[PDB]
Amino acid sequence: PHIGNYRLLKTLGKGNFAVVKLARHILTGKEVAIKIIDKTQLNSSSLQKIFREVRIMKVLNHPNIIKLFEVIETEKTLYLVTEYAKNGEVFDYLVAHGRMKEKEARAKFRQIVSAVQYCHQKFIVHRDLKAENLLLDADMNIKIADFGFTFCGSPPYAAPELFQGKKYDGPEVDVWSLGVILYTLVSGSLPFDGQNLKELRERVLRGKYRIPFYMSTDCENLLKKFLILNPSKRGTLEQIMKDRWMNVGHEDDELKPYVEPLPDYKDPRRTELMVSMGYTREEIQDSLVGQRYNEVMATYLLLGY
Ligand SMILES: CN1CC[C@@H](COc2cnc(C#N)cc2-c2ccn3nc(NC(=O)C4CC4)cc3c2)C1
Numbered sequence: 001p002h003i004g005n006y007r008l009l010k011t012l013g014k015g016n017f018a019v020v021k022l023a024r025h026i027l028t029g030k031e032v033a034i035k036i037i038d039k040t041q042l043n044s045s046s047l048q049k050i051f052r053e054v055r056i057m058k059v060l061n062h063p064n065i066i067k068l069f070e071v072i073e074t075e076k077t078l079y080l081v082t083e084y085a086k087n088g089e090v091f092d093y094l095v096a097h098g099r100m101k102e103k104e105a106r107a108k109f110r111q112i113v114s115a116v117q118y119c120h121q122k123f124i125v126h127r128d129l130k131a132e133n134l135l136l137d138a139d140m141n142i143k144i145a146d147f148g149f150t151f152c153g154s155p156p157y158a159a160p161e162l163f164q165g166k167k168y169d170g171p172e173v174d175v176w177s178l179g180v181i182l183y184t185l186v187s188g189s190l191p192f193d194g195q196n197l198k199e200l201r202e203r204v205l206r207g208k209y210r211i212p213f214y215m216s217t218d219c220e221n222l223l224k225k226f227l228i229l230n231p232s233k234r235g236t237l238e239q240i241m242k243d244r245w246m247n248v249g250h251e252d253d254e255l256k257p258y259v260e261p262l263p264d265y266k267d268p269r270r271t272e273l274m275v276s277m278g279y280t281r282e283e284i285q286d287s288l289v290g291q292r293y294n295e296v297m298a299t300y301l302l303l304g305y
Contacts, residue, residue: 003079004072005295006034017041018149022084025069027277028302032069033085035149037078053148054080056124058291061260064115064142066135070298081298085135085143090185091153093136099188102219103249108134109182110246110255111142116178117237118258120171127168129177130157131184155200156180156190160229163201172231175240179226186219187212191227205229218245265289270303 001008006023009031013020018037025032039047057068057080072079087093090108094100100108112134119126126133128146132153135143159176161168183191191209194200203209207229211220222245228234240246241255265288274284279296287296 003034003036004070005299006032006081008034017046023081025081025298025302027299028305030302030305031084031086032081032302033066033083035080035082037080037149038076039078040076049148050078056147057082058293059122060119060124060147062115062118062258064111064144065118066143066145067301068293069301070295071293072295083137083143085145086138087136087140089132090134090136090142091131094131094184094188100185102186102216102245105182105185106245106248108142109185110250112144112181113178113237113241113246114255114258115142115144116174117241118260120174120237121257125169125171126174126177128154128157129174129181130154131181134181155197156192158204159231160205160207161231163205166231170231171236172234175226175234175237176228176231178237179223182219182223182226183209186215216245218248222246263288265300267300267304270300273303274299 003023005026007026009022009024011019012022012033018035021034021036023032023034024030037050042050054068054071061067066085067083068080069083070079070081072081099105116126116129124147126144126147130153133144133146135145137143157177157180159168159173161173180191183189192200192203194203207227209227222240222243225235225240225243238257241257246255247253265285271281271284274296275281277299279299283296284300286292287294288300291297
């Protein structure tokens with residue numbers, strides 16, 4: 001049960017393409033998730049998508065997005081070592097506990113909106129936002145996952161453009177799915193449903209949904225800023241951040257675009273511990289400035305917890 005500096009612990013998910021395992025980084029003692037991809041079993045276009053996802057993961061550094069720590073490549077197998085979100089998916093938490101009170105849904109939703117807006121700053125569109133892709137860490141903080149690697153709960157989140165044959169590429173697609181996510185957080189149910197796809201599509205294209213009796217007028221006013229049939233009439237996430245419901249109980253701390261902190265490759269506390277482990281100062285610096293995502297860089301990132 002061993003890959004690089006990691007002790008393979010248990011299986012968190014399985015497939016024909018990839019196996020996600022829980023693991024312990026031996027040097028630091030931290031638990032991580034490791035996606036193990038047999039590249040020989042991939043189709044013609046699947047490896048291009050996996051490589052695109054790796055590229056996106058390397059650039060995203062947000063407290064509410066699953067952080068990548070290491071990439072290990074061999075001819076046949078690709079290993080992606082990422083952050084482990086102990087409390088599973090928001091989807092399962094909603095099934096287990098029911099709807100969140102607006103105060104609890106607000107805490108989660110401010111983190112989700114911050115994360116998706118931060119992706120949009122770097123021209124990254126998720127296109128598959130759903131409760132299944134929103135994970136929860138040990139402190140119940142949101143951790144967004146899946147930027148390329150299928151539709152078990154995907155159709156209820158699809159923007160009307162999918163069913164109209166129109167383009168499905170802009171950030172406005174994510175703005176629609178975020179309205180569906182807000183709806184499930186506060187109701188435990190989906191705004192657009194059906195028995196088959198024909199029934200789902202009719203409801204999505206009509207754009208009408210039930211307002212549950214307990215929903216506040218402030219919450220419904222916010223939902224109407226996301227669930228707009230015309231993609232060109234949907235507001236940006238930067239504009240939506242200024243909404244009243246978003247900031248109830250955050251009168252000081254208004255939600256605004258995330259400002260990524262500047263890189264710190266010379267932390268003396270971590271550099272000293274790494275030198276004691278056997279790494280050299282030059283090994284540490286070259287790995288960090290080159291953004292290598294190798295075992296040295298991974299140890300520096302893992303030591304930041
Ligand atoms: C459809 N859903 C399945 C899971 C999620 C996709 O998960 C990932 C995808 N890509 C990478 C990479 N590289 C990494 C993860 C990941 C990152 C962190 N975690 N914490 C967990 N935690 C648990 O399973 C807890 C025991 C319950 C699982 C996971 C999985 C979306």
